[PDB]
Structures are given as structure tokens and as C-alpha cells.
């Protein structure tokens, strides 16, 4: 929904680093997560596929189960309390950016990967929270 930042890995992470350091960050994807960690930023929540507190969840590709939605809500609960949470998904977390935006505090940056293209960065605001609810 937000802004795509283009470039070969890891140049987009380097471009946005200053912004990532000044806000809480949620990462969706193994490549996104790893790349944010390696520039010294610790996500409050990181969701990635199986191949800090750990939560496990199964989510069949191209769905948003009730279980994923609960795990994400729980994650944000734990993050409110200053835990970093890694959600390890068995299945696929292809849609997980939507709930991330729903349940997130305002001013949170959510990142996910645009295959081959770059990194999508989303500033969490009442508008984009509104539409993400609509998307579901």
C-alpha cells in the first residue's frame, strides 16, 4: 500500500535506515527481516516462513486464518511490553502485512518485500488502518 523503495539488496535498507531507527519496525519475510537485523535495527515483530519470543503458526498459502490473526494480535501485545517477537509461519505469510497494519500502534513502520522489485515501507496511520480492515 505504501512506498516501494527500489534497488539491489541491500541498498533500500541503507536508504531508509535513519527512518527505521526512529520508529518501531515490523518486518514481513525472511529476506526483509534478515536485512533489517544486519543494519542494526531490531524489529518489534518479525514474521517469516519456516525453512526474542517465538510464536509458531500454520497458515496455508494465500489465506489469512483466524490463527494467524490471533498470533499477530498476541505479538503486538508482547511488543507493547517490550518483547521482540518472531512469528515463524508454516505455510505462507504472503498477506501478513495487512493484519500487521491493523493491530499496530500508529507511527509503526511495516516492511515487506516486493519480489525482485524492492522493499515496501508503510507508515501506519488511521487512513491505512481503515483500508486494511476493508481489505479484509
CB of 50 to Mg ion, least distance (A): 12
106 or 135: whose CB is closer to Mg ion?
135
Q: Report if residue 43 touches Mg ion, rule: CB under 5 A.
A: no
Structural contact between residues 100 and 68, judged by C-beta atoms closer than 8 angstroms: no
CB of 88 to Mg ion, least distance (A): 13
Reduce the DSSP state of residue 7 to 3 states and report it. coil
12 or 128: whose CB is closer to ligand GTP?
12
Q: Which of residues 44-63 bind ligand GTP (CB under 6 A)?
A: 48-49
39 or 67: whose CB is closer to ligand GTP?
39
Helices within the chain (DSSP H only):
11-15, 17-20, 30-38, 66-80, 97-103, 126-135
Reduce the DSSP state of residue 131 to 3 states and report it. helix
Amino acid at each position: 500500500l505504501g512506498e516501494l523503495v527500489r534497488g539491489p539488496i541491500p541498498e533500500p535498507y541503507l536508504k531508509v535506515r535513519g527512518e527505521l531507527e526512529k520508529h518501531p519496525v515490523v518486518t514481513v519475510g525472511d529476506v526483509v527481516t534478515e536485512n533489517v537485523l544486519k543494519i542494526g535495527v531490531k524489529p518489534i515483530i518479525a514474521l517469516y516462513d519456516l525453512k526474542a519470543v517465538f510464536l509458531t503458526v500454520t497458515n496455508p498459502p494465500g489465506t489469512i486464518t483466524k490463527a494467524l490473526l490471533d498470533t499477530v494480535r498476541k505479538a503486538f501485545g508482547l511488543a507493547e511490553r517490550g518483547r521482540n517477537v518472531h512469528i515463524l509461519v508454516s505455510g505462507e505469510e504472503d498477506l501478513a502485512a495487512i493484519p500487521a497494519v491493523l493491530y499496530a500502534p500508529l507511527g509503526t513502520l511495516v516492511l515487506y518485500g516486493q519480489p525482485d522489485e524492492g522493499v515496501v515501507l508503510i507508515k501506519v496511520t488511521p487512513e491505512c488502518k481503515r483500508r486494511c480492515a476493508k481489505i479484509l
